[PDB]
Design a protein around this ligand. Structure first.
Ligand code: A1A5C
Length: 167
């Protein structure tokens, strides 16, 4: 039993809800919230901008120190940093960016990072400003993640298309 409330169950391990991921995190304080990061951990917009703004820029300050020490992430890669006021940990995961020209096959590699955590709150990787089709992202998630993932989708209308088209 966990405190995630009101999610539709898609499979044995994948759940989905129309919700603000920042509000879900603020409400649930999960062990792990996933950020839709880029390789430079520059949290400008989308999920990343919203998460970082909710931490009062502390996520960005921590991230800049991480990059100064370690250099950029790989597309498809991840790092674990603090969850600040939102979660115990934030798993920063880099899905491929279609608006940058990155190969969508790396989306599976990106989702594999979730398997290192038993339970996660997460957005749909590579969707939104990263350019990929959210329906495809959901399919890759279901076919790749084996741990318990709670997907928060902010837009009610997008949330409806994903449910109604789910195989
Ligand atoms: C202020 C908040 S909370 C939040 N929680 C989740 N996703 C997004 S944006 C997003 C990212 C990837 C796939 C779909 C969407 C979507 O349109 O729902 C957001 C935004 C902008």
């Amino acid at each position: 039993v966990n405190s995630f409330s009101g999610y539709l169950k898609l499979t044995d391990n994948v759940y989905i809800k129309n919700a603000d991921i920042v509000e879900e995190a603020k409400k649930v304080k999960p062990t792990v919230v996933v950020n839709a990061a880029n390789v430079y951990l520059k949290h400008g917009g989308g999920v990343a901008g919203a998460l970082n703004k909710a931490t009062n820029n502390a996520m960005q300050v921590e991230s800049d120190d991480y990059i100064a020490t370690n250099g950029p992430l790989k597309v498809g890669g991840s790092c674990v940093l603090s969850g600040h006021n939102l979660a115990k940990h934030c798993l920063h995961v880099v899905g491929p960016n279609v608006n940058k020209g990155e190969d969508i096959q790396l989306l599976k590699s990106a989702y594999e990072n979730f398997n290192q955590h038993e339970v996660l709150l997460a957005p749909l990787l590579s969707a939104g400003i990263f350019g990929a089709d959210p329906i495809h992202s959901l399919r890759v998630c279901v076919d790749t993640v084996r741990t318990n993932v709670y997907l928060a989708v902010f837009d009610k209308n997008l949330y409806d298309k994903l449910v109604s088209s789910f195989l």
